[PDB]
Design a protein around this ligand. Structure first.
Ligand SMILES: Nc1nc2c(ncn2[C@@H]2O[C@H](COP(=O)(O)OP(=O)(O)OP(=O)(O)O)[C@@H](O)[C@H]2O)c(=O)[nH]1
Ligand SMILES: Nc1nc2c(ncn2[C@@H]2O[C@H](COP(=O)(O)OP(=O)(O)OP(=O)(O)O)[C@@H](O)[C@H]2O)c(=O)[nH]1
Ligand SMILES: Nc1nc2c(ncn2[C@@H]2O[C@H](COP(=O)(O)OP(=O)(O)OP(=O)(O)O)[C@@H](O)[C@H]2O)c(=O)[nH]1
Ligand SMILES: Nc1nc2c(ncn2[C@@H]2O[C@H](COP(=O)(O)OP(=O)(O)OP(=O)(O)O)[C@@H](O)[C@H]2O)c(=O)[nH]1
Ligand SMILES: Nc1ncnc2c1ncn2[C@H]1C[C@H](O)[C@@H](COP(=O)(O)OP(=O)(O)OP(=O)(O)O)O1
Ligand SMILES: Nc1ncnc2c1ncn2[C@H]1C[C@H](O)[C@@H](COP(=O)(O)OP(=O)(O)OP(=O)(O)O)O1
Ligand SMILES: Nc1ccn([C@H]2C[C@H](O)[C@@H](COP(=O)(O)OP(=O)(O)OP(=O)(O)O)O2)c(=O)n1
Ligand SMILES: Nc1ccn([C@H]2C[C@H](O)[C@@H](COP(=O)(O)OP(=O)(O)OP(=O)(O)O)O2)c(=O)n1
Ligand SMILES: [Fe+3]
Ligand SMILES: [Fe+3]
Ligand SMILES: [Fe+3]
Ligand SMILES: [Fe+3]
Ligand SMILES: [Mg+2]
Ligand SMILES: [Mg+2]
Lengths: 416, 457, 457, 417
């Protein structure tokens, strides 16, 4: 029968029997040990939450929103099948994340294997496919009157993008595909869910109230294309929600210490590659930077890798252990300066590795005595959604910092 | 040099430079990966807080309380050194916890090494001593003017009991310092307030007690030739309500049925796989899980990782542990059979636990059953619900003072407060669980449990 | 056409057009000037909420609960007519309250006219009848399918009660509808949760009960040829927590000594000021404050404006009342002497209240005091504090059901729950106050009080 | 001994005995019957608070802020005397308010007596002077080492405007004190935080501002050879967020439509009720509602009870006010005629409020209009936001008048360009 589960943000939540059947599986439970903020735990001790409750809340919000929208307009003929499909799509929307969520996808894979284009959402859809294939849930889905063949696709295109390429549901129900992932707006249930969770755990007071937005949701035909919007007097609501988004990003998501900590973690991970063997399908062994291409190995890849590197004794991981000890000792590198991103051009992901060579090869003009190689500089790209560039140096000496300042200023002007 | 940290419960905390040096060491940072609630996560998905925040909050509360008391009564002659020592003692009051907090020192240790009785207090004592010795904090402590020889022993005696006036760290005219962080004469201390606040904030439950009022109504006056901390005579109801809140939290969250089941399953998984594990210690030596408590460096590497490490194990020797953990993952748990009317007129002892399943198996039900069970097919757990002093009345040992005479201490009995208070102050529960899941097995287990209960008080 | 109201406690409140039609009426907007806690606003500076939002919240909660019960069980033949009836009945459940809420019907009326029994529920019923008779609401009620003949009688029954099975508005199979707004059997209703939340929010004291969990586990099952609202068998602890929270909130806020003394002196001022205030009634007549209950038109314009009118009036006929109110303004209150211990092994009946001043004055102290105190300088208060059932255990009358038998009712006694429950459910309290202010008078009053308390056991 | 009072915003508070003595007087205890938001209670049923707790919180916040500033900078030579002076002055910064605290000074007095300037700060300061004079507070003020003669002037200058250095209470060394209770330099003072927090809590909206952070990061440094309050450079975003909260509050609650029309109609009811009710005054004299401010012994008798008195009075001479209040209570309010385009200057002067209703009636729109509407049917509302904005209302509710009224308004705005 129905099952009830609580949560700090929302109240008691009801779960469909099929949803709980999906939940109880190792692949989904793997989210139990991935931190929401990833590397932010080491600056704000309140960000101790995982992705499990995030997924549960996103699913609950999607279900409630769709039910409320369908209640007040019974002439759209929305069936329980649509509700279940959208709830399932929302529930498994973040299965592809690796250790610490964002950083692994955004800084590690593009650095270890530049020639491969990878995004955590593609990994999420691959993981969902493997999950549904490996656990025999399809007969259960058929039991509850839900057609597997079409609905599996429906979910697949609900989570990721496919003059109408969609092939899951005809145009008469085109308003469903923008509930969990809205292409032209970017505001969905996931947005509100993770905002609420982040402000609650960090301690920042929120300003938005999604319950009002649900209370004033209506759907009507626009250009032969059903759309969802609210009344015109919610301008203040939208403005304060966007202000909260900007404040949250500026305060937490771009904190200097958190990002440099993520940089240290990814440097330790990449330096320790080619020494860790992870069991995969058929006994095949994979590296941490290569496991992305298989799901059996990726299942056993979580935040535990960092701790495992920390508490190993093999002599082949000496550098990684030293870096991890240094972060634990709060002997954290140094910040030099900030860039000037001017050109409309965007630094392509696979061009990061060139950047240290470019900065090192740059010839300073000011009187500099110490010459530094290209192995003692770190540069990172921050995608503001603008692009920001920050620089860090291996050395901590004041004189070395002065030389690093000259290299950065000359190079920054050189690249316009 | 001053530093600031944010918390979700309180505001922004401030740490002395010595606290900054102490905090950023591997021994203390080890706590970052120990869950506060332990086995309660799997039932309350919001309980994702470790011991680091708890320690920080306890330290802050102790510092604030001592500062307030020093400000109210300037005649006590309380110097900055006393405040710093109290703060440091408060910070490191839970260093000795093992994996899953109470798991290690409540269920595993008694079952793996029944020849010893170990509690996390002296483990924390050893950990703190090792930290101080190995991280070379003595020169900085001296540089700040604090005296190591006396104050280190003062802190050590603060975390644990005395080991006639037995204390030796500080003279008798400062005896009110020994009941700020850890209190034995009564349960009043900052730790209780801090964990109340954090647990009720994260779980999703609403608390009733607020510590600001009690801190605002604090005073010290001599009692029995001893300086103590007394509360105003009108707050007895507040203390009774606070202890009722403690009991409510224990009944609601910490002692959930499924939480205790997952606790016991993880304990069994740890027990069945200890031989095929090695932890490097001092001088390259290796220790088992159970024997790791005798070497501090080997102990430092013992955290929540071991759970998933067994989950991700590949050697054939860990097959049973991996199977049990996967059985947990599929959420195929032991099925609860039935509770019994609270105990009776007896009190089952600590060493009699192993007998109960034998008794249940030996029970002979009147109605013949198609399924016959064995001694290892039943799990019996006993829960001790009390007010923190094993059937004694905690309020009786608290000194109160009146507004008319703010320098006299009086004790208020039970009859002078109300007539709506519990008659007793402690009770014991009996839980029975079956390791089989088939309907016939559950029916047989219920019949056997009813038979045994009828053959019992 | 559905209106929306912003409530700081709940979210957005949605009202049927008939409900908003009812709201906007003088006999209802009268409630905007009746403070909830009476004199408590002078001790707790955060309690100023009136009865208007309280009634709105009660109605909204009743609507939500009935909607949930209808949703989880569509076999009850529940319709929109019943929902509207319940909402309207619950929205006007406290119409008859006089100035300062409970003070008027607890301290004033018993003294002014002790020869008539009056409870504010009957006042609310008669005020509702006045509303219906005056505002011509019957046609709009008919326009929405409501049949006044039965609907109005049913709404009346839901407020007070009966007026085999005495009810006539609805058949037996809908008997559970009477236990939603005000329950006479065990005492669980939306009013409790509403006022708990509102008072705990406004005063500044955290609450402990969350009604969401209770409504989640709500169900209706047959009980002795009669349908009733029943809770899950695992929820007893939370019900006891609810009752404990109610009692604690009572003892903490609703019976504060300063609040009670302020209320008593305001009642004394009102009684002294009687026979000099005229309020226009029906047909241009004149009614006294004590006689203002016979005609509802006069009773309509009786709000707390009377307090300020008496305070600020320059009429020489009310000089004593003006002096008393200037004294309560100046914080020259009557002093507090002491409180006896519960005499609840044998209760004190209502009619003996006026004797206590005589008894305390007649008691002869042994220590001789120069100042002599008469029976006119002593004020005696009696406080009745309990679970609201006069030694009867409310939980004993609540039906429970198990998971595997969703259509069977079982009763749980006190023993099977826990042995930490209170032994005594109700008791009595007594206070004594000295009108005079000089130190010698307080000393003599304390001596007299201790002598009397020792004399009466 | 010191006293403790519970406040659901700042929690428990510590009160000096002198402030307790000040509180326990009628001149201050009367503020328990004045609603903070005035007419707002009829649109948001959760805003029932009164100015008493607002004053308490403002005093406590000022005391705490000055205490922290003195603690973290001992070089300023701050004594308990100045701390007490600031605390009491802040406690008595909102004492002169009339009924609803904004209807009276906002619209009523400038209409009935449009030739006398009146700001409620002036009433507050003079009523404070009367309170200190008429309750024997000078001996107590002397008991606690507080010099009366200079400190009363210091408090007055703190409450009312300053009236090269114009101040007299203290020399230039303590020049940062006057900016605490009333900050005319940048507009940040404890009063703003207090009433923002109280309104946000009671209305049912979440505010993200935190004054404790500012107190932690605030200090005073010598700038331009004088002392001004300065903060760190990393909390600019926090200040901008606070400004956003202020703007949202003003645009959401303080300027609500129905509340504004309710306040205007209440002002009309009071205006009509004038000349009929008398308030006893000093020496047994009688004063009218409009003239009650001249002798503040009577002004102490002006509370929100006037509304109830008008509603429940049976004098035949109060008929019009009676049915106006009954219309208020029946939800039959005035109808929103139009909204102004306040471009150009549109800076209505305080002395021309009564002229605008007559001017709007004099407009001649270029449309056929058989019906005739008199200037008394048109109501002109002026509110300053910081920009000026204007609106008009029609007493009549028939459809024909609604159409007719629109033509005059557009014509007048066109006439005003
Ligand atoms: N040291 C330390 N800081 C923490 C911790 N948790 C959160 N923080 C916060 O993170 C911030 C970053 O610390 P640091 O890397 O030392 O940077 P900083 O605070 O500017 O100090 P410096 O780099 O030495 O100038 C601190 O200021 C703390 O407020 C912790 O566990 N240890
Ligand atoms: N199934 C499941 N429950 C969870 C999870 N996280 C927290 N819970 C809670 O833990 C409780 C475990 O209950 P059940 O899984 O139903 O097991 P049970 O208590 O024996 O009840 P039955 O399934 O009916 O036998 C649930 O009621 C949930 O509210 C989760 O990830 N999966
Ligand atoms: N004096 C005063 N107290 C208030 C006011 N508002 C709320 N209170 C609270 O009400 C309580 C009443 O206490 P007291 O005035 O001291 O009188 P008491 O409690 O009988 O004790 P005594 O001071 O000996 O008279 C105070 O402690 C305040 O916390 C107010 O406006 N004036
Ligand atoms: N009806 C009503 N509304 C109230 C009351 N108290 C506060 N309000 C709020 O005040 C608002 C104003 O309601 P109206 O007088 O009808 O103003 P209006 O919405 O412009 O007029 P309509 O469009 O006809 O509803 C309502 O939406 C309520 O949210 C009350 O007692 N009755
Ligand atoms: N008293 C309580 N207050 C708040 N949350 C609670 C309480 N009891 C349990 N919870 C939480 C624990 C889980 O997160 C969720 C479900 O708990 P609970 O109702 O005990 O389910 P259960 O699985 O133990 O029982 P059932 O046998 O009825 O399925 O609610
Ligand atoms: N249980 C309580 N919890 C929180 N605040 C309370 C409680 N009881 C009272 N308060 C508030 C009321 C006032 O705001 C302030 C003072 O109350 P309280 O301490 O009870 O004073 P009192 O009048 O009983 O005694 P006294 O005059 O001796 O201080 O605290
Ligand atoms: N049966 C229990 C008892 C408590 N806890 C956990 C919940 C709290 O977060 C933590 C409290 O930590 P402490 O032991 O330091 O606090 P106490 O002093 O209250 O513990 P105790 O009274 O048992 O000594 O213990 C638990 O998991 N299960
Ligand atoms: N000294 C006080 C102060 C508060 N109350 C008010 C607040 C509570 O909401 C209510 C008590 O609740 P009960 O269950 O005893 O009955 P009610 O008074 O709520 O019924 P009604 O809704 O008719 O007021 O009375 C009180 O009883 N007396
Ligand atoms: Fe997500
Ligand atoms: Fe602890
Ligand atoms: Fe009520
Ligand atoms: Fe103000
Ligand atoms: Mg369950
Ligand atoms: Mg007092």
């Amino acid at each position: 029968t129905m099952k009830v589960i609580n949560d700090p943000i929302h109240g008691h939540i009801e779960l469909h029997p099929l949803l709980v059947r999906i939940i109880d599986t190792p692949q989904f439970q793997r989210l139990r040990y991935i931190k929401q903020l990833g590397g932010g735990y080491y600056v704000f001790p309140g960000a101790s939450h995982n992705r499990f409750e995030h997924s549960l809340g996103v699913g609950y919000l999607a279900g409630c929103l769709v039910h409320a929208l369908g209640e007040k307009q019974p002439e759209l003929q929305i069936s329980e099948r649509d509700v279940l499909c959208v709830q399932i799509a929302g529930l498994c929307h973040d299965l592809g994340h690796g250790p610490f969520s964002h950083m692994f996808d955004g800084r590690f894979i593009p650095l270890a294997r530049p020639e491969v284009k990878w995004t955590h959402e593609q990994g999420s859809v691959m993981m969902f496919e493997h999950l549904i294939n490996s656990n025999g849930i399809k007969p259960v889905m058929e039991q509850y009157g839900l057609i597997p063949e079409e609905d599996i696709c429906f979910i697949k295109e609900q989570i990721v993008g496919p003059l109408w390429p969609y092939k899951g549901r005809p145009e008469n129900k085109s308003f469903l595909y923008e509930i969990v992932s809205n292409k032209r707006n970017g505001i969905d249930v996931d947005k509100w869910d993770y905002f609420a969770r982040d402000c609650h755990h960090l301690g920042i007071q929120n300003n938005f109230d999604y319950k009002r937005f649900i209370k004033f949701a209506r759907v009507c035909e626009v250009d032969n294309e059903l759309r969802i919007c609210a009344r015109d007097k919610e301008v203040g609501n939208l403005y304060d929600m966007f202000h909260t988004r900007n404040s949250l990003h500026r305060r937490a998501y771009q904190h200097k210490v958190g990002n440099i900590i993520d940089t240290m973690i990814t440097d330790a991970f990449l330096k320790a590659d080619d020494y860790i063997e992870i069991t995969g399908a058929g006994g095949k062994k994979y590296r941490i930077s290569t496991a992305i291409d298989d799901m059996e190995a990726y299942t056993k890849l979580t935040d535990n890798i960092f701790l495992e590197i920390l508490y190993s004794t093999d002599p082949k991981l000496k550098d990684a252990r030293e870096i991890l000890k240094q972060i634990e000792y709060r002997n954290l590198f140094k910040y030099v300066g900030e860039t000037q991103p001017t050109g409309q051009i965007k630094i392509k992901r696979e061009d990061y590795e060139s950047l240290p060579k470019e900065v090192a090869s740059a010839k300073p003009k000011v009187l500099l005595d110490v010459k530094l190689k290209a192995e003692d500089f770190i540069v990172d790209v921050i995608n503001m959604d603008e692009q920001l560039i920050r620089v860090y140096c291996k050395k901590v000496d004041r004189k070395s910092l002065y030389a690093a300042r000259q290299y950065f200023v000359q190079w920054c002007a050189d690249r316009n």
